[PDB]
Design a protein around this ligand. Structure first.
Ligand SMILES: CN(CC(=O)O)C(N)=O
Ligand SMILES: CN(CC(=O)O)C(N)=O
Lengths: 401, 401
């Protein structure tokens, strides 16, 4: 007979990514929230809140995943395909597996985990209509309430242990920087260098952590037109001497993202290029000093925009000055409170980890046409910000010969 | 606060994946569906449905995207950070760019593409709550109705251009195969082996295809207990001879997924493992003979289950026998009306592309503990099915000496 749910407690639970106290403290806070709002349970569906509160980063493949938090339990809800793996990772009190063998066994693992509730916490910014229709009909009485906004402002501030991991990741993003430069060669295709820098960083992650999963780490190396978009995919484009290049290296550790992005030039850079690179570096140096406790996001933006207006390129600009770090990727995560944009009145506090990442982009046509961008990570402390990114920027270094 | 929407026509339109006629055929069948439903526009927000229809595969990083499809238009809605890259990919009539500079500019660009509707068709299995509440507030006069079910069933039957694409990708997965075998040494870490395979594949895609974007292509290469869930993340475990191994190699080409998966051993396989591999290989060669037009998914599950039950192992199956190919990856797509599951009664039809990947998994400590899995892809045609997976399976060849 084909059961709807099981348990697969296979092999031993791994050494987790953060201490037990770290997890206990995040799970404590979130429950002080539930309790304050008379929310019986949270059901998380998103990669990044599952990961943040239990150390399990799931693989969706178009199956649903869940983490159900009550005052007493933390229960991960995985697919039978994953075997014992979700259980050996979860920092929580249980793991219930659902199977393929009937439709919507997932909502039976859920109702298993949380047999009754008058008020349930869901991620409005992540749960879809069909799944919400589903969950509401397993609990027609419950009130379903957002929790995502309250949990994002709790992830907005980093722990010390979070800061140490973001330091190690910025050290690795530094190594993938150096392996970009080594690989970098006239007539090199973009994908050769991106393979090279990827292997250099997976291989340092493997090195620094023992019970580490090696996932999703990547490199975007962009050249010539392909620098016109800060997330444009790797292409077969051969690098020529003098072309504008963009180095972007992203170690992914345990769901934790860090980045190194850097304008570079092979052999030379022309003076129409050098002079726009030197305006972009001047706004980057300025924003470094603007990252301080007590600074409001909105104001950092307007302060910085005056520099680009002084130089007649403010229109070249393409995206916010910086965002928040933490557990996020290109496909999950990101604390929307946390963005360096013209209408975000958020004040920086100690503990936050923000980037500084000015960009200008000049279309094809214009002298110096191409994307320029430099990206550092700062940790907000007492007294200022500690910039953790040590690879050099700007023309004094990044014209490679 | 500076503009909200703009256009960037930067550079030239790339050479698309498919033929213009392939994109005209897809958008003509979508429009015949919307007009028969009297739905004024579809708004797609999913990776898969935007890729399917317009050949633009976006990078979220926590920004929303759209494809708005009318009887006359196809407009993509991409963020200012990507500059010109969306428009160069979009097989459509317009691209509109929204900026970061004020909140929910994205909505301002959709109301720009689609100034008035009465009934707008959206994806319930993808769209989130919060966005759906913002959309509805834009268009209070308008009925939001699901199109993702209509679209999945359209996607389910591939054209011949899609077939030839999926042959290409299975060829390159057979190249990623042989690089696993190249790389396999005693006491090789999992990650090294993954890295050597996926470099093999990146470079193959980059030969074959022109105008191609090199993204997402991975390997899972699992040893010992890490073979206990098919989607399990590379670790730094080293391979011992005799360990049970799993090779899984996934070329990701223009949003088109294919995969090779094979049990293998280095130098020898115990008795207990051999016995269990030969069962799983037996159920695989039966599943290959059941895949044919007319067949029900339900009857296929339930015949192979009889085989496994004859070897008293059925209780060790972990997931469905296989699924539908097309535009998907680990983080998007998958045609849920296409699954080789016990209660699914879709009938296979020519042009479907499915897998056959039986698995059993025995928990540590039982004799022949580990995960066993073979995985081929089959094109369904008018007479049977063509199996595109050419790498060998079973012990005759996958005991690597
Ligand atoms: C993450 N990304 C920034 C953004 O999406 O705002 C970068 N660094 O290009
Ligand atoms: C995609 N995955 C199959 C599934 O999720 O059912 C692989 N082949 O292991």
């Amino acid at each position: 007979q084909m059961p709807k749910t099981l348990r697969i407690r296979n092999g031993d639970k791994v050494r987790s990514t953060f201490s037990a106290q770290e997890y206990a403290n995040r799970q404590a806070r979130l429950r002080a929230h539930l309790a304050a709002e008379n929310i019986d349970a949270a059901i998380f569906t998103s990669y990044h809140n599952i990961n943040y509160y239990s150390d399990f980063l799931y693989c969706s493949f178009g199956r649903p995943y869940a983490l159900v938090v009550t005052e007493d339990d933390v229960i991960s809800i995985s697919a039978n395909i994953d075997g014992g793996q979700p259980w050996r990772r979860t920092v929580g009190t249980d793991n219930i597996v659902y199977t393929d063998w009937q439709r919507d066994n997932y909502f039976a693992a859920i109702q298993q985990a949380l047999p009754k509730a008058r008020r349930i916490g869901i991620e409005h910014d992540h749960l879809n209509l069909q799944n919400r229709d589903k969950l509401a009909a397993r609990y027609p009485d419950a009130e379903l309430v957002d929790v995502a906004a309250a949990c994002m402002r709790m992830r907005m501030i980093k722990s010390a242990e979070e800061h140490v991991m973001i330091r190690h990741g910025a050290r690795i993003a530094d190594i993938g920087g150096a392996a970009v430069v080594e690989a970098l060669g006239d007539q090199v295709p973009e994908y050769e260098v991106a393979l090279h820098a990827t292997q250099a960083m997976v291989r340092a992650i493997a090195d620094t952590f023992e019970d580490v999963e090696l996932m999703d780490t990547w490199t975007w190396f962009q050249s010539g037109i392909n620098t016109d978009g800060a997330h444009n995919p790797v292409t077969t484009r051969k690098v020529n001497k003098g072309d504008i290049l963009s180095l972007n290296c992203f170690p992914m550790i345990a769901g934790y993202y860090t980045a190194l992005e850097r304008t570079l030039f092979l052999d030379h850079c022309s003076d129409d290029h050098l002079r726009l690179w030197q305006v972009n570096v001047e706004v980057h140096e300025a924003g470094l000093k603007l990252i301080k406790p007590g600074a409001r996001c909105s104001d950092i933006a307007r302060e910085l925009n005056e520099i680009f207006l002084k130089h007649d390129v403010l229109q070249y600009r393409t995206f916010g000055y910086g965002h928040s770090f933490g557990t996020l990727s290109h496909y999950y995560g990101r604390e929307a409170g946390l963005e360096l944009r013209e209408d975000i009145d958020t004040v920086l506090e100690p503990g936050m980890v923000v980037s500084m990442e000015p960009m200008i982009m000049l279309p094809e046509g214009l002298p110096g046409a191409g994307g320029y961008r430099e990206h550092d990570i700062l940790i907000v402390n007492e007294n200022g910000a500690e910039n953790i990114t040590k690879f050099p920027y700007g023309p004094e270094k990044n014209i490679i010969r």
